[PDB]
Design a protein around this ligand. Structure first.
Ligand code: HEM
Ligand code: HEM
Ligand SMILES: Oc1ccc(Br)cc1
Ligand SMILES: Oc1ccc(Br)cc1
Lengths: 137, 137
């Protein structure tokens, strides 16, 4: 289930983080505009950039902390607010987050692995609700 | 994105090259008049010709180099000049290139592979502009 999925992802966090993030950019190529340092770079080029691995891992680490603190895929309002208030997220809208979770769920369903994809979809929906409540446009 | 798509195509170039060129010829059958011995043949007959695959590979080898040398999907003017000046292209106009890129983008959109088709559309438009700047009719 969802708790096991957190363990699966955490076990190889950097690989899953990179693969899901690339799935996101591949599904929604226009989203690359928010990452000026990743524009015009192949996947292998990206993987050779210190910040790509470091930042992508740290994003997914925080995602997993939020997921683990949730009750029945309902995240803490405080966690949503952290995400809204981050300077790095100042120009984002809930639609950016919606897209990330659509891509994440698609990745899980396409994987040969037994992720609880329905729960990740619902977690994403609940997180979007919480972001909106915390003031994200 | 675009840069990764170049790697994807290069990883199976003969297959992609033939399938895109066939998509072009099937969408625009009268374009066969620029070529020799292509009329009156089905796709499988074309693919079994001595030089169909070889010629198509050489075209797409160069197309991928032009794409790879581009910045933000803008090709080098030297690459455009080469394409205009090639003896093999003496009877072409920019419209021939426009049609090739319409077919290429349509192929990408229909494929099971996550191509950044919008970037290929932009690249095609920028290549056509560059061909015009370099003196193609
Ligand atoms: C629940 C989902 C998300 C979480 C947990 C999250 C978390 C984070 C974290 C922890 C950082 C700082 C990384 C570091 O210190 O190196 C960061 C940076 C950033 N995030 Fe988010 N983020 C999420 C979603 C998104 C989305 C959907 C976008 C845009 C489509 C986005 C855009 C950015 C940008 C542009 C930065 C700064 C540039 C960079 O480090 O690449 N984030 N995020
Ligand atoms: C960016 C697009 C293009 C590139 C990079 C390109 C490149 C090339 C190259 C490298 C060759 C040499 C093939 C060989 O001798 O093995 C070639 C030949 C040729 N190309 Fe282009 N070409 C492009 C577009 C077109 C278009 C749109 C047409 C016509 C609709 C065309 C018509 C021809 C013809 C008639 C030849 C010689 C005969 C043949 O290969 O069958 N090309 N091209
Ligand atoms: O550096 C980053 C990697 C992935 C996301 Br999502 C956001 C920032
Ligand atoms: O041999 C050729 C294959 C594809 C194109 Br486009 C042009 C020539």
């Amino acid at each position: 289930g969802f708790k096991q999925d957190i363990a699966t992802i955490r076990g190889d966090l950097r690989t899953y983080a990179q693969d899901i993030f690339l799935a996101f950019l591949n599904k929604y190529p226009d989203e690359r505009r928010y990452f000026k340092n990743y524009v015009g770079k192949s996947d292998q080029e990206l993987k050779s950039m210190a910040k790509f691995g470091d930042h992508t891992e740290k994003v997914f680490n925080l995602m997993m902390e939020v997921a683990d603190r949730a009750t029945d895929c309902v995240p803490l309002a405080s966690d949503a607010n952290t995400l809204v208030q981050m300077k790095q997220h100042s120009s984002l809208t809930t639609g950016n987050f919606e897209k990330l979770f659509v891509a994440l769920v698609e990745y899980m369903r396409a994987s040969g692995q037994s992720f609880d994809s329905q729960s990740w979809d619902r977690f994403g929906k609940n997180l979007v609700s919480a972001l909106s409540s915390a003031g994200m446009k």
